[PDB]
Amino acid sequence: NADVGCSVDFSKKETRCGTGVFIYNDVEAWRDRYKYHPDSPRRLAAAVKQAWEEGICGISSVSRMENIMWKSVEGELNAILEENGVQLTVVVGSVKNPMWRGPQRLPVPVNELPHGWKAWGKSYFVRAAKTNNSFVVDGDTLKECPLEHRAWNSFLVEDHGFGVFHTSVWLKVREDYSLECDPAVIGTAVKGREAAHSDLGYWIESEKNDTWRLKRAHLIEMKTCEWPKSHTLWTDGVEESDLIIPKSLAGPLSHHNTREGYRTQVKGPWHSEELEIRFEECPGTKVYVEETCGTRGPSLRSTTASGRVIEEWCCRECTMPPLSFRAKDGCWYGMEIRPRKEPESNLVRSMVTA
Amino acid sequence: YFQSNADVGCSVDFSKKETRCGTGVFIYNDVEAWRDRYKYHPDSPRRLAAAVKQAWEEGICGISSVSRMENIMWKSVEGELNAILEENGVQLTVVVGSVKNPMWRGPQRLPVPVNELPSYFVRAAKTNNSFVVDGDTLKECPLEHRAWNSFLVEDHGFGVFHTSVWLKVREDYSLECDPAVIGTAVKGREAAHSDLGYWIESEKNDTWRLKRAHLIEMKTCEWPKSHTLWTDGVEESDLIIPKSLAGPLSHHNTREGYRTQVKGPWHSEELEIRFEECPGTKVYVEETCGTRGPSLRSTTASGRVIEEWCCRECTMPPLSFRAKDGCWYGMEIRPRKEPESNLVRSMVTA
Ligand SMILES: *[C@@H]1O[C@H](CO)[C@@H](O)[C@H](O)[C@H]1NC(C)=O
Ligand SMILES: *[C@@H]1O[C@H](CO)[C@@H](O)[C@H](O)[C@H]1NC(C)=O
Ligand SMILES: *[C@@H]1O[C@H](CO)[C@@H](O)[C@H](O)[C@H]1NC(C)=O
Ligand SMILES: *[C@@H]1O[C@H](CO)[C@@H](O)[C@H](O)[C@H]1NC(C)=O
Numbered sequence: 020n021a022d023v024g025c026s027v028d029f030s031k032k033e034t035r036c037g038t039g040v041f042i043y044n045d046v047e048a049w050r051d052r053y054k055y056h057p058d059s060p061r062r063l064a065a066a067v068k069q070a071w072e073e074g075i076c077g078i079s080s081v082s083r084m085e086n087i088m089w090k091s092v093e094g095e096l097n098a099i100l101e102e103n104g105v106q107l108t109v110v111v112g113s114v115k116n117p118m119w120r121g122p123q124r125l126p127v128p129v130n131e132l133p134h135g136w137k138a139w140g141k142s143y144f145v146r147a148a149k150t151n152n153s154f155v156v157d158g159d160t161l162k163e164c165p166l167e168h169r170a171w172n173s174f175l176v177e178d179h180g181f182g183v184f185h186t187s188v189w190l191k192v193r194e195d196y197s198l199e200c201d202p203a204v205i206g207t208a209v210k211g212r213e214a215a216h217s218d219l220g221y222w223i224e225s226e227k228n229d230t231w232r233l234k235r236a237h238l239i240e241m242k243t244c245e246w247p248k249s250h251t252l253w254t255d256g257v258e259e260s261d262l263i264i265p266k267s268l269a270g271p272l273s274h275h276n277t278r279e280g281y282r283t284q285v286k287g288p289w290h291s292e293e294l295e296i297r298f299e300e301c302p303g304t305k306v307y308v309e310e311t312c313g314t315r316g317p318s319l320r321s322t323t324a325s326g327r328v329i330e331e332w333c334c335r336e337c338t339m340p341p342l343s344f345r346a347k348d349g350c351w352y353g354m355e356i357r358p359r360k361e362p363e364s365n366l367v368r369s370m371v372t373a
Numbered sequence: 374y375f376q377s378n379a380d381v382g383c384s385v386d387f388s389k390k391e392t393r394c395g396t397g398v399f400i401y402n403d404v405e406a407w408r409d410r411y412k413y414h415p416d417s418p419r420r421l422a423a424a425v426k427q428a429w430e431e432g433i434c435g436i437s438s439v440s441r442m443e444n445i446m447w448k449s450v451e452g453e454l455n456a457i458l459e460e461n462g463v464q465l466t467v468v469v470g471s472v473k474n475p476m477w478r479g480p481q482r483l484p485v486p487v488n489e490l491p492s493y494f495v496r497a498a499k500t501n502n503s504f505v506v507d508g509d510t511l512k513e514c515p516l517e518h519r520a521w522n523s524f525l526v527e528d529h530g531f532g533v534f535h536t537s538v539w540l541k542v543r544e545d546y547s548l549e550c551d552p553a554v555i556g557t558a559v560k561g562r563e564a565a566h567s568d569l570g571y572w573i574e575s576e577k578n579d580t581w582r583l584k585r586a587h588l589i590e591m592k593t594c595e596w597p598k599s600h601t602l603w604t605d606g607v608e609e610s611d612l613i614i615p616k617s618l619a620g621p622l623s624h625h626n627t628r629e630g631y632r633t634q635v636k637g638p639w640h641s642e643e644l645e646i647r648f649e650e651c652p653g654t655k656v657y658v659e660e661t662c663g664t665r666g667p668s669l670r671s672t673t674a675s676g677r678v679i680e681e682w683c684c685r686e687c688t689m690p691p692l693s694f695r696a697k698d699g700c701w702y703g704m705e706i707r708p709r710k711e712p713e714s715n716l717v718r719s720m721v722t723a
Contacts, residue, residue: 020563026382026399032531039401040558041384179389186391208398208558210377255605
């Protein structure tokens with residue numbers, strides 16, 4: 020509440036300074052400035068060892084930055100485990116979207132794993148030998164560790180740390196059970212006729228038109244924790260079935276997360292690595308409102324597998340401009356928006372149900 | 374023109390341990406700033422004059438300003454409005470007085486003038502008909518015949534020494550506070566609900582709760598839920614700053630062991646809500662205490678400190694209000710031994 024800053028205020032036509040609350044868009048910024056780090060690698064190693072002994076065979080990361088943290092500390096955790104004679108290998112793979120919940124939780128260990136004080140030699144520097152027992156973090160590893168035996172949402176941000184090139188975000192294993200997204204990295208603000216619900220992976224803009232409505236959003240992850248109402252604007256009398264970004268995808272439970280003529284986009288292209296929600300026709304396409312249209316269904320891409328653009332689309336009672344998702348492989352339409360003449364079986368469809 | 378999600382700036386971020394720049398949303402504390410950097414101005418003095426003239430002809434005899442900034446605007450345009458009215462042969466004089474708190478509602482509304490009228494230096498003779506804005510004028514123009522909340526901010530305008538805020542007479546009837554000048558933000562463990570008169574801080578303890586507030590006006594419009602955090606499951610009787618005093622309808626405007634402070638010292642020109650003992654006093658939680666009543670000041674009218682206070686089931690540190698005349702206690706907190714009849718009490722009920 021007591022940060023000091025200066026800014027160009029475009030809506031108030033002034034450049035000024037003062038104290039206040041400043042919410043930065045670090046989602047769309049090309050500069051990477053935050054890195055997650057364990058509060059204590061030796062304590063995290065002990066939590067992993069205990070988790071494994073309790074039948075927790077791996078991790079489903081909540082967020083893109085958690086997976087990056089696991090990848091950067093993998094070698095260190097394995098060296099600590101080997102230093103203590105623990106036959107266990109942390110194996111960190113890629114994130115797949117959506118980042119589905121797991122039901123287990125890392126335990127808080129009483130003690131960290133200590134230093135071994137082994138003879139001076141290459142063991143202080145080289146990676147640990149691979150073992151028979153893989154503690155798998157994300158990756159394509161469901162056969163060896165099914166999702167129901169993985170821990171998810173076990174961390175809380177303990178503090179931020181100063182750094183010259185990156186700002187550290189220290190993560191600690193929490194004691195409490197929670198489904199909620201970590202509020203330490205959430206920033207939500209409204210000013211005049213625009214608002215943003217944000218964290219390190221979601222930048223969700225709303226605006227006052229005739230009513231408040233979703234304006235645009237950019238998501239560089241697809242997480243499944245619950246966005247906390249404490250950090251959400253205008254939460255009363257909201258119907259979850261009207262929330263554009265579903266609750267089950269960390270959508271804010273807010274009138275700001277709604278748009279007339281659209282219901283919750285549970286079958287959007289949430290397999291995508293990142294998505295922009297934009298109310299605008301896909302390139303080369305037109306949408307027509309007509310009750311004869313097909314019904315809501317899986318989101319469809321505007322281009323076929325061969326690259327052919329589908330020119331004409333419809334929706335039974337949605338509103339213009341149309342809801343679209345912009346992804347690396349092209350432009351996708353809201354669930355309401357179906358091809359007008361083309362069979363849907365010729366198109367690329369979302370296989371995800373959030 | 375009205376986009377505020379893409380400002381650019383730099384800041385010292387104490388909780389994230391960084392000084393950095395970027396794009397985003399910046400919510401400034403303009404309440405506790407050293408100066409007024411904003412000035413309300415009518416979008417058109419001549420249009421406002423026409424609205425006043427027609428209002429007078431409809432039996433609206435004056436104005437109750439919604440905000441401190443609106444009253445300052447009326448004072449600045451008074452002479453010009455009266456010149457315009459005199460130029461058009463209208464036997465009417467706008468008379469602007471000071472604001473009293475609370476700035477109570479009125480049920481009338483300025484009309485959007487059907488016919489427009491066809492100056493900054495003219496010294497208009499006073500007429501026999503007074504259109505009174507605020508002031509100690511309730512006898513000649515009762516509250517039930519005054520317009521209130523008739524303006525909407527149309528736009529901001531650049532200025533070297535002050536940023537202009539242009540006000541237009543609105544068509545629609547509303548009780549809502551103008552959202553054009555509201556900023557609300559939460560980041561991590563702290564939040565603020567703010568406009569040009571209220572700075573309301575909340576924090577995450579075991580639960581989210583009111584931390585502190587600074588108010589430089591006491592207004593009575595409704596704080597819009599659109600600009601409010603966490604509005605569901607809220608009991609309005611738990612809102613520390615009452616709904617009827619533009620309190621946000623939020624869990625952030627609550628504090629365990631206190632209910633809504635309808636009889637706080639809202640006649641104050643400015644106040645700080647602070648959870649802290651009044652100087653030289655102690656509060657004991659004990660069931661033998663008196664029940665909730667009008668807020669009492671910690672000092673007698675002659676400045677003597679009442680040392681020992683109690684509450685039946687409030688929480689420590691105690692809810693207090695800091696004003697120019699001293700330190701006042703939340704409704705729950707009563708003198709432990711001294712009779713209340715010896716103390717200074719709030720006479721207002723929000
Ligand atoms: C590791 O696994 C092999 C089988 O591939 C097994 O024979 C061996 O005993 C194991 N090593 C241990 C348990 O130390
Ligand atoms: C609302 O949005 C529509 C289309 O998105 C636009 O044409 C219209 O001007 C807007 N109305 C407002 C901002 O009052
Ligand atoms: C002026 O108003 C007073 C009432 O305050 C009235 O008694 C008087 O007759 C009026 N004089 C005029 C209209 O010349
Ligand atoms: C809550 O505030 C009290 C003081 O009122 C403080 O002692 C305590 O540490 C705080 N608890 C948390 C969880 O911040």
